[PDB]
Amino acid sequence: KPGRTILASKVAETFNTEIINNVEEYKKTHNGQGPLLVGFLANNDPAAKMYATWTQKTSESMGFRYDLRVIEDKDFLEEAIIQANGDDSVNGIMVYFPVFGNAQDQYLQQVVCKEKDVEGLNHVYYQNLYHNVRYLDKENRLKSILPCTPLAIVKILEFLKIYNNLLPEGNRLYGKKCIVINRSEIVGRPLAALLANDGATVYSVDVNNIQKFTRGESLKLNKHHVEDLGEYSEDLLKKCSLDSDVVITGVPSENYKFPTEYIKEGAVCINFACTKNFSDDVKEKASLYVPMTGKVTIAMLLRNMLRLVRNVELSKE
Amino acid sequence: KPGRTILASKVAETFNTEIINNVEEYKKTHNGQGPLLVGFLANNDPAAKMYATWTQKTSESMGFRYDLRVIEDKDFLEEAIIQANGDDSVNGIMVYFPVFGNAQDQYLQQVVCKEKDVEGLNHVYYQNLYHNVRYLDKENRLKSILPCTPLAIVKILEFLKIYNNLLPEGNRLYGKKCIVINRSEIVGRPLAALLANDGATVYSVDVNNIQKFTRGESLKLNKHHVEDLGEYSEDLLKKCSLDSDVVITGVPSENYKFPTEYIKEGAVCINFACTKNFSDDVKEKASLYVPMTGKVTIAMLLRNMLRLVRNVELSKE
C-alpha cells in the first residue's frame, strides 16, 4: 500500500495565517513598514541560489522586506555582516552556506548579531537547546529561538500527527524511535538531541560511528544522555534503522543512497539535505515521505524573526 | 653553519619573574590563596597526559592551585564545564583537546565561562583578534586576551629578536615574510592573520589550497586582507616557502615531513603540533629552530589567567 507524499510547501502553508497576522501588527506600529530581513549569498551554487529566491519571494509575499546581498569573494562576507549588525534598519540577518564550507562557516555563524540571527545560528541557541533552557532572560519573557532546520523537521513531525498530542509537552515522542543519518554540529547532532528530549530513542548515525541518544540521566544537567554503540558497520546501520520507525536523513552527498531494505513498514521518512538521498522507490515501505524541508525551513526562520523582533521591543526598555 | 636550537622552556623561563609577582600580589588580597585553575582531561592520549602534567606542575610551581579533573566518557565533559562555570572557587578553566576531535570540540570551546576561559578558546577572543579590537569594554580597561597558542608563537618571535623593535607597534613585522603550514580555526588561521596585521606577508597553507594574508585593505573593517592563490600544488608550496624566511608548522600528522629543500638560509622554523613535522636535518639551513611551543603555550594561558582575574576584579563593581 503506497506511501503518501507530503510536500514541504503543504507543511509551510500551515503557518501562513499565523505569520501574516504578526507581520501585520508590526506594520501598524512601524507605519506599514514591515520587518527587513537581509539575506547573504556568497557561494557559486545554483541550488542555494534557487533557495535564496524562494526565501526572497516567500518573505516579501508575507509582508517582509527582503534585502538580498550577494557577495563576490567570501572573505568580505564577514565585513558585510558586521555593518549589517549595527544597521538598525536591518531587523534580521541570514546566511546561505556553504560559504567557505568548513570551520570558517561555523565561525561565520557566530559573527551574526545575536539578536538579529533569524536562523538560530548563534551558539547560545544551540546550548539552550541541549540544556533544555526555554528563555534567554531571567523574568522568563525572552523565549530562546531554536535553530530553524532542526526545528522545522520537528514541526513537520507535529503536522504528520506522529507527535502523540495526548501526552504532555516534553514527552510527546515517548514510545517512538528515530534514526538520523547525519550528525553535524549545524543540524545533525542538534536534531537528534531535540528529538531525544521529547521522549523517543534516537539512533544517531555518523560517518565513523553510531550512537543512541536517550532522555537525560543526570541531575546536574538537563541534557539528553548519549549512549554509545559499536563502530559504524553497514549491517549495524541496518538493525538500528529497522527498529526505528522514523528516519531523518541529511547527508550532503549528491550520490548517497539509503538502502530501501532498511526502512520499516509505516516508517516516516524525511530528508533535509539539499539533495535526494532516499532511493525513489522508498514510497512502497514508508507511510509518509517528505522529499525536502526547505519550504518549512523558510517558514521557521520567518516566524523566528518575528520572535526575535518581539524580544527586541520587549527588551527595548 | 649549523642552526641553533631554542627550547620552548628557555622561552617560557623569560616570563617566570613577571608571572610570579602577579600571583604573589593576588595571594596577598586573597589570604595567601592563589588562583585556582581547573584543567579538563578527557582523552585517551598519553601525549596530552604528559602536557597535562607539565601544566599541572608548572602552575603549582608558580603559586597556582591546579585542580586536574579527569573525565571518563566525553559526553559528561560538558556537564563538568558548566558546574565549574558557576563555581566561584574556580578562577580559570582549560580543556585538553582532542576530546571528541571534531566540531564538538569547537562547540565545547564555546561552553566554557567566557570570563574564566584561560586559553582564549571563546569565539569573542578570536573575533577581537581578527577585527584588531584591543579591549572588551568601552572604557578601554578590559584587555581582550588572545588565544594562547597563536599568542605563544608570536612571543617566541619577540624573544628570537625577529621582531624589529625599532618599528612602532602593529608594524614591527613589516618587511618580513612568513608561511604557516596549517589553517585551523583553532590556531592555524588566527596565527596567520595575527602575523599579517603586524606587517609581514603571510603564505597560509591548507590541505586543499594556498592563500596570502596581508595588511587590511578596507576602511569598513580593520581585518587582515586575504589574498587567494592557486590550488595546493606541491611545487607551489615550495616557491612560497622559499621566499618566506619564517616558517611555522602545525599539521597533526605524526608522519608529516616538511621537505628541508623548502626552507631558506637563515629561515626561522617553529612547530606547534604535538608531534615533529620538521625533518630533523632541518638545522643545517634554518637560523633558529624551536621544536615545540608547549612550554611557552602554558606560560601564555598562565599570564592570560592573571589578566582575566584582573578583569574580573576590575569589573567586580
Count of H helices and E strands in chain B? Answer: 9, 11
Q: Lay out the sheet containing A65-70: strands in order across.
A: A65-70, A36-41, A92-95
Chain A: residue nearest B189 by CA?
Answer: A104
DSSP state of A135: B
Q: Under CATH, what is the fold of the domain A1-8+147-294?
A: Rossmann fold (3.40.50)
Q: Tell me whether B97 touches chain A (CB under 8 Å).
A: no
CA distance A109 to chain B (A): 11
Q: Maximum Cα–Cα distance for chain A, whole Å?
A: 60
Contact A185, B104 (CB under 8 A): yes
- Contact of B135 with chain A, judged by CB distance below 8 Å, is answered with no
**Cβ–Cβ below 8 Å for B104 and A185:** yes
CATH 3.40.50.10860 domain extents, chain B: 11-118+295-317
With CB atoms and an 8 Å threshold, state whether A104 touches B185: yes
Q: Of B202, B100, B201, B195, whose CA–CA distance to B153 is shortest?
A: B195
b/e for A274-283, b at 16 or more Cβ within 10 A? bebbbeeebb
> Is A80 annotated as belonging to a binding site?
no
- Resolution of this deposited model, Å: 2.8
d(CA B228, CA B209): 9
Taking the C-alpha atoms of residue B187 and residue B191, their distance in angstroms, rounded to an integer, is 6
* B11-118+295-317: CATH number: 3.40.50.10860
Residue numbers in B near A226 (CB within 8 A) = 75
**Closest chain A CA to residue B112:** A127
Distance CA B182, CA A198 (A): 41
Residues of B in contact with A110 (CB under 8 A): 110, 123, 127
* Cell of residue A209, nine digits: 560511528
Sheet order of strands, B92-95 included: B65-70, B36-41, B92-95
- Nearest partner of B177 among B129, B214, B216, judged by Cα: B214
B303 is in an annotated binding site: no
Nearest residue, CB atoms, A106 vs list B78, B106, B228 = B106
Distance CA A41, CA A71 (A): 6
Interface probe with A: pick from B100, B108, B127, most Cβ of A within 10 Å? B127
Q: What is the DSSP string of B297-310?
A: HHHHHHHHHHHHHH
What DSSP string runs through B31-52?
A: TT---EEEEEE----HHHHHHH
* b/e map B282-296, b = 16+ CB within 10 Å: bbebbbbbbbbbbbb
Which H or E element spans position A85? helix A77-86
Query: Please, what's the largest Cα pairwise distance for chain B?
Result: 60
Q: How far, in whole angstroms, is CA B207 from its chain's centroid?
A: 21
Q: What are phi and psi for residue B227, nearest 5 degrees?
A: -90, 145
Method: X-ray
Residues whose CB is less than 8 angstroms from the CB of residue A196 and which lie 6 or more positions away in sequence, other chains included: A202, A213, A214, A215, A224, A225
Residues with Cβ < 8 Å from A31, sequence gap 6 or more? none
Answer whether B123 sits within 8 Å of A123, measured CB to CB: yes
3-state secondary structure of B54: helix
Cis peptide before A150 (omega within 30 of 0): no
Q: Please return the burial class of A82, using the count of CB atoms within 10 Å of its CB with bins 0-12, 13-18 and 19+.
A: middle
Q: Which residues contact A107 (CB under 8 A, 6 or more apart)?
A: B123, B126, B185
Q: With an 8 Å Cβ cutoff, is B217 touching chain A? A: no
Label residues A160-170 b or e (16+ Cβ within 10 Å = b). bebbeeeeeee
Cβ contacts of residue A233 below 8 Å, gap of 6+? none
Q: Is B14 exposed, middle or buried (0-12, 13-18, 19+ CB in 10 A)?
A: middle
Q: Measure in Å the smallest separation between the Cα of B185 and chain A Cα atoms.
A: 6
A217 in contact with B at a CB cutoff of 8 Å?
no
**How far apart (Å, rounded) are the C-alpha atoms in residues A4 and B179?**
57
Q: Do B220 and A79 touch (CB under 8 A)?
A: yes
Q: Report CB contact under 8 Å: B123, A110.
A: yes
Q: How many residues does chain A have?
A: 317
